Amino acid sequence: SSSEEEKKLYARLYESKLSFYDLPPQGEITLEQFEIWAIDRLKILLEIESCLSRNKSIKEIETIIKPQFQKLLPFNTESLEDRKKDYYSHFILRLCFCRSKELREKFVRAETFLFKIRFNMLTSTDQTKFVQSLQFISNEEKAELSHQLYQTVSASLQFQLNLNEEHQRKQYFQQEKFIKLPFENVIELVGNRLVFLKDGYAYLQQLNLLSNEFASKLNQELIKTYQYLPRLNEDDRLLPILNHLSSGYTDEINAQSVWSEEISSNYPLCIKNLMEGLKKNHHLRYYGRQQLSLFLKGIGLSADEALKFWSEAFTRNGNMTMEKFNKEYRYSFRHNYGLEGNRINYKPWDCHTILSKPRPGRGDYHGCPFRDWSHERLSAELRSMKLTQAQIISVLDSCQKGEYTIACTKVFEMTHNHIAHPNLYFERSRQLQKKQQKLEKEKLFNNGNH
Amino acid sequence: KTNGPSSSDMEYYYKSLYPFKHIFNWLNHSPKPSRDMINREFAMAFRSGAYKRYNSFNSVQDFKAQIEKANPDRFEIGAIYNKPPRERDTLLKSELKALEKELVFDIDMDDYDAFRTCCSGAQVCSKCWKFISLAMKITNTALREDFGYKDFIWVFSGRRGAHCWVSDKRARALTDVQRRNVLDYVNVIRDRNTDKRLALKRPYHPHLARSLEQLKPFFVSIMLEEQNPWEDDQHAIQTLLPALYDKQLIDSLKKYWLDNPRRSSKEKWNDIDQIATSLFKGPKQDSHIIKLRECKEDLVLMTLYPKLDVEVTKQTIHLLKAPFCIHPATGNVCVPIDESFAPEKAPKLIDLQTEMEKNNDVSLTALQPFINQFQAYVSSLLKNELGSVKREREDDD
Numbered sequence A: 001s002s003s004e005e006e007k008k009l010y011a012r013l014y015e016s017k018l019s020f021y022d023l024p025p026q027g028e029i030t031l032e033q034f035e036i037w038a039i040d041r042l043k044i045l046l047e048i049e050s051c052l053s054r055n056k057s058i059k060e061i062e063t064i065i066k067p068q069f070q071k072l073l074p075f076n077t078e079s080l081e082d083r084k085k086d087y088y089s090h091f092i093l094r095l096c097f098c099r100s101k102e103l104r105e106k107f108v109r110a111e112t113f114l115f116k117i118r119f120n121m122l123t124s125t126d127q128t129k130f131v132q133s134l135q136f137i138s139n140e141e142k143a144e145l146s147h148q149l150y151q152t153v154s155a156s157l158q159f160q161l162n163l164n165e166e167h168q169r170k171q172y173f174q175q176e177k178f179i180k181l182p183f184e185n186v187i188e189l190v191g192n193r194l195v196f197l198k199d200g201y202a203y204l205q206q207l208n209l210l211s212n213e214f215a216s217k218l219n220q221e222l223i224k225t226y227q228y229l230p231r232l233n234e235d236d237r238l239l240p241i242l243n244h245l246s247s248g249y250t251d252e253i254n255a256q257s258v259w260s261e262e263i264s265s266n267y268p269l270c271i272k273n274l275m276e277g278l279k280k281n282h283h284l285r286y287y288g289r290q291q292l293s294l295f296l297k298g299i300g301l302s303a304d305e306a307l308k309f310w311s312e313a314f315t316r317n318g319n320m321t322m323e324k325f326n327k328e329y330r331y332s333f334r335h336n337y338g339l340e341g342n343r344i345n346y347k348p349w350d351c352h353t354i355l356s357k358p359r360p361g362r363g364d365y366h367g368c369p370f371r372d373w374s375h376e377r378l379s380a381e382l383r384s385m386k387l388t389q390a391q392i393i394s395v396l397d398s399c400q401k402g403e404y405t406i407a408c409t410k411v412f413e414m415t416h417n418h419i420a421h422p423n424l425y426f427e428r429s430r431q432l433q434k435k436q437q438k439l440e441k442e443k444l445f446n447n448g449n450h
Numbered sequence B: 001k002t003n004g005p006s007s008s009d010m011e012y013y014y015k016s017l018y019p020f021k022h023i024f025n026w027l028n029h030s031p032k033p034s035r036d037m038i039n040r041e042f043a044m045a046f047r048s049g050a051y052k053r054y055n056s057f058n059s060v061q062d063f064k065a066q067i068e069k070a071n072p073d074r075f076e077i078g079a080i081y082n083k084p085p086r087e088r089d090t091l092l093k094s095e096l097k098a099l100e101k102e103l104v105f106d107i108d109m110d111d112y113d114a115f116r117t118c119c120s121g122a123q124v125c126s127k128c129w130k131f132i133s134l135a136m137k138i139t140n141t142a143l144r145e146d147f148g149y150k151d152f153i154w155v156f157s158g159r160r161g162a163h164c165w166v167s168d169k170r171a172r173a174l175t176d177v178q179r180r181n182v183l184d185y186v187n188v189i190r191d192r193n194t195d196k197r198l199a200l201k202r203p204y205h206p207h208l209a210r211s212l213e214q215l216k217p218f219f220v221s222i223m224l225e226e227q228n229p230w231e232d233d234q235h236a237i238q239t240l241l242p243a244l245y246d247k248q249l250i251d252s253l254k255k256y257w258l259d260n261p262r263r264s265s266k267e268k269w270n271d272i273d274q275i276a277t278s279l280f281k282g283p284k285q286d287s288h289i290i291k292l293r294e295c296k297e298d299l300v301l302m303t304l305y306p307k308l309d310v311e312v313t314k315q316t317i318h319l320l321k322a323p324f325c326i327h328p329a330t331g332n333v334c335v336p337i338d339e340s341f342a343p344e345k346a347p348k349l350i351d352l353q354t355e356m357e358k359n360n361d362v363s364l365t366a367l368q369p370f371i372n373q374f375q376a377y378v379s380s381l382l383k384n385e386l387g388s389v390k391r392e393r394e395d396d397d
């Protein structure tokens, strides 16, 4: 397709700033565009999910997401590239999440909430243009039923749009359009008496019905895409990105201070488990040693202090001679820091790469405790962290659903007041600790002048 | 103690009096037998207390013969299944799926005894039957103007209640969720406790406001004069005062009625306004007046709005007593209800036997008008069913 024809089709599609994603995007995009747009939309959806799991109000979620919109997925722009980004990201995520039923449910829920937010941020004229772009009633029919419709919708207006004055409510109602549809499609709104009923037809709260239709259509299209996926399995190029995206949903620091309580309060539970295993056994197996070493490098421990740390931890029991440590372990610890071989500076393991680990056996301390520990044992340490029974129950409920990172964020929040990286947990804890220390110092200074 | 109909009386009623053909044509939705009857569940209640479910009949004669042979005290109508319920024992429990049943509503006097004085306990008369009459009026209002239903009929429960059978193809095919939605639309009075103010949501839904306007002219004539339940000061304190919103007004009215005992319901109704006017003064008086009017409207609805039995409507598999059945304790025929119906007008089985002794023909008995009414209803239902089939065929083309 000529670039010009492609632009024409895309403009015919965007006549409104909002879309049902009915027709497949046509055109070619590069792999960098593919992956970057997919990851950006995925970040937006993950932030939506994290806000929802914390029972945040709709206004708070909107306020949190607006800067993320301006940064990752610009909406309400006239640029063709941003609209292309939204459409292609949506269809890439359709390809990603069609594999399993639970993924489908999470995707449709998050996408419907995103639809709701975007519709809420639109202007009333744009909303009218979008809904016009499901039969609207004539002005005569609205005039005949005006009293009943206004009586039905006055409470919804007051509570949803904060139109406290009656004059404003009437003025809005005069401009509001109504849709006539059978009450069986809007039984949910019928139950709460939010829609007017006449002769078996419900007069429309429109956002809720639009979201319901969008979710239903999205579910059906995900099912069709799942049926057509094995034909796409022949593309060696997209499969790794799709697999990664689908699984993505799931001298202050030296060798001595890393053991201190001041630094020890900040690690996540995985790191505490690895360090406890190292202290008890004076040895960590390969995966645990790698996880711990990469964390320690990521938190500021230099290479020489890392070698000192590992040698001191390993030789404490006398079972390991310094000669054996230098013969077998020194090379690997230097390699982790990019000082050996191809000098590759290995990045610290995020949560996802840790979970991609092969499951800890007997004698293993690596992995994620929230996935790899029994419920009783997790309850034991969460009690040791002075968490209440309700907080422990919430964390265990998050763990049961497979949202281990959500539970990690939860324990962070309860112990300190979305995290997907051990170094991120450490950094946030350190920043909070420094802020608290500065506040305490300011309070001490203020109390000394009276 | 008027003994209920004997077993021989039930045999006689079933052999000579039950309009088996009309019920069959009603439930079959076609002059020719179809799966709407062969796959319909029927439950039969016996004098011994036995209850046998999942009965089904293939034809008019089979229905009559099975009912005659069983001689139950009553039988209840179930939903259409994908397979004949009578063959359940050869089927897995997960294979019998309900597909269609008439929308059903049940209204009884039990929820209105706190506001009636013309009868006590399980008694009923024309005065208290006005509660059921207003209930059917409001329910028919909702079903006709809001849901667009056309083929529905009310039938006497036998003692003091009424059952509604909505036979519209749209109503018959409703899922349990949709049935719950219609019930929640109609069931405004969810809390039946009279010792607590309803505090209904404001502004009223148009259905609620329309029902209030329909019930307002009857509130005086029934409650304040004919029943007069708040003449008793203790009954007033128990049921009228808790519907008010202000504690000071409640205490003032309580003291006034203690000092002036046995004021009638109308006098107490006027005293509420008089004392409220005496108490609430200043720029805030308008809000108090509005709230008192709201409480009075809430009490009007609490006292006269339909109080449905919520279980029977919720699910497609629920069983309800078939029309023309004999009430075991009263002997009344569960006849269909018109605008002039009263409980004393329901024919008794012993009276029907006495009439048949003089004239051995059902057409010459008191049961005949109700049979004719039911036949006309069935004919209209069949005509509408044919129209719906034609409309579906036109839509498919």
Ligand code: SF4
Pocket: A268, A269, A270, A271, A350, A351, A354, A367, A368, A369, A370, A404, A405, A408, A420, A421, A422, A425
């Ligand atoms: S969620 Fe991540 S950071 Fe937290 S304990 Fe598990 S692996 Fe460590």
